[PDB]
Write a protein that binds this ligand. Structure first.
Ligand code: HEM
Ligand code: HEM
Lengths: 201, 201
C-alpha cells in the first residue's frame, strides 16, 4: 500500500478505530515465497495499532498457521467501508472513475498463542459488546469452547509498522465532493459517515 | 485459505461470478519477503478464474509494481458479502459464533501489461455495465484517459490456482439455517442472496 498525502489518517486514533470496528481481517504471509491469506477475526490489544498486539485464530486443519514458525513476517489487512465512484456522480465531462475506501495494514512478526481459549473468548467479548443484546456464553457454551479447542490455532501479531489509507475523496472541490457524499449517503451510509469523520478538526 | 468441502462453490461458474461482482480486489506479493498489498480494481478475462487472466492497474507512484518485474507470484483476493453470525441468531445453547463470507483467491505469476489503455478501458466497461445508468466515456474522456496513462501501471495475472470459499452456513440444520438467513435478509441482503444462490441446483 501507498498512501497519498490527501488520503492519510487525520487523527492517530482513526487507525485503531478502524481496526476495532472491522475485526474480520485478512491474515497474509509468505508460504514458500508465495502469498497465502486466511480470513479470520482479529482483535487489537492496546491503544494503538503500531506497537500494539493483534490476536486471532484459525482452523487447525487450515495449513496456513503451519508456516508461522518458518515465515514469521505477516500482514494483517483490516478493511472499512468502500465504494465505487462512478463519473456519473461527478456530473463532469472528461472524467475518470475511482474507488473510495479505508483500510489499515498492520505488519509484524506472527507467533502461535498458547492460550487459545483466552484468544477466542476475548474475540467473543469484542464482537458481542456493540450488539444489543450481547450474547454472553453460558456455562454450557464455555464447556463447548473447551471441547472445540483442539480444532483451533490461536496466534499473536506484534505489530512493527501500521499503514492507514483513508481514500475518501478529500482532494475534490466542494461541488464534486458534495455529489460524491450525496451518492454514498443513499447507497453506502457507512462510507458517508467515514467521509464526515475524515473532515474533523 | 482452507475451504471445507461443504463451503466449496456449488457450481464452478460461481467463483467467476463472484470475481466479476466484486472487482475491488487486494493484490498481494512478497516485497523483500514481507507481504505487501495494494487495493486495486481487477477484472477477469475468460470464462473461468483458474486458467484465466486477471487484469488490473495501480498508481505508478505506488512502488509495489516494481516487485512485479521479477515476475513473482501474486495472490489476488476478491471478497464478496460477509457478516458476523451471532449465537443470538441461532437461539440455541451450547453455541459458538462464526463469520459467514464468500471469497475467491487467485494465485499466479504477475506481468506488467504494455497495453495499459486497454486494461483501464475494459475495467471501466466492466464496472459501469451493471450500473443504471452506466457511464459511457465520451470522446473527451477517452482523450483524458490517454493523458493519464503515464501515471498508471497496468498488470496481468495468469491464474494458476484458484480457491473459492462460500462459507454460508450450509452445514446448519434447517431451523438454525432459517434463522441465520432471516437475520441476514434484514441486515445484509447481499449475503442473504448469496446464501440462496448457494442452495440452488
Ligand atoms: C467470537 C467470534 C468468532 C468468530 C467471528 C469466529 C470465526 C471463525 C472463522 C472465520 C473461522 C475459520 C478460520 C479458518 O478459515 O481457518 C473459525 C474457525 C474455528 N473457530 Fe472460531 N470464531 C469465533 C469464536 C470462536 C470460539 C469462542 C471458539 C471456541 C473454541 C471458536 C472455535 C473455532 C473452531 C473449532 C474453528 C475450526 C473448526 C470450525 O471452523 O468449526 N471460534 N472461526
Ligand atoms: C474503471 C474504474 C476504475 C477504478 C475503480 C480505478 C481505481 C483506481 C484506484 C483504486 C487507484 C489507486 C491505486 C493504488 O493505490 O496504487 C487508481 C490509480 C490510478 N488510476 Fe484508476 N481506476 C479506474 C479507471 C481508470 C482509468 C480509465 C484511468 C485512465 C488512465 C485510470 C488512471 C489511474 C491513475 C493515473 C492512477 C494514479 C493515481 C491517481 O491518479 O489517483 N484509472 N485507480
Amino acid at each position: 500500500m501507498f498512501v497519498p498525502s490527501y488520503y492519510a489518517a487525520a487523527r492517530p486514533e482513526q487507525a485503531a478505530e478502524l481496526v476495532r470496528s472491522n475485526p474480520f481481517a485478512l491474515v497474509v504471509s509468505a508460504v514458500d515465497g508465495v502469498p497465502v491469506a486466511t480470513h479470520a477475526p482479529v482483535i487489537l490489544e492496546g491503544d494503538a495499532v503500531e506497537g500494539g498486539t493483534l490476536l486471532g485464530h484459525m482452523n487447525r486443519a487450515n495449513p496456513h498457521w503451519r508456516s508461522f514458525a518458518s515465515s514469521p513476517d505477516v500482514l494483517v489487512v483490516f478493511s472499512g467501508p468502500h465504494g465505487y465512484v462512478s463519473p456519473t456522480v461527478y456530473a463532469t465531462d472528461p472524467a475518470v472513475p475511482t474507488w473510495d475506501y479505508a483500510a489499515v495494514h498492520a505488519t509484524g512478526r506472527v507467533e502461535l498463542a498458547e492460550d487459545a481459549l483466552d484468544v477466542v473468548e476475548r474475540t467473543v467479548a469484542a464482537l458481542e459488546a456493540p450488539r444489543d443484546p450481547a450474547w454472553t456464553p453460558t456455562p454450557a457454551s464455555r464447556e463447548y469452547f473447551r471441547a472445540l479447542l483442539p480444532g483451533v490455532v490461536a496466534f499473536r501479531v506484534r505489530v512493527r509498522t501500521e499503514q492507514s489509507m483513508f481514500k475518501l475523496s478529500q482532494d475534490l472541490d466542494a461541488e464534486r465532493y458534495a455529489r460524491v457524499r450525496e451518492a454514498f449517503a443513499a447507497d453506502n451510509p457507512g462510507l458517508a459517515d467515514l467521509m464526515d469523520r475524515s473532515l474533523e478538526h
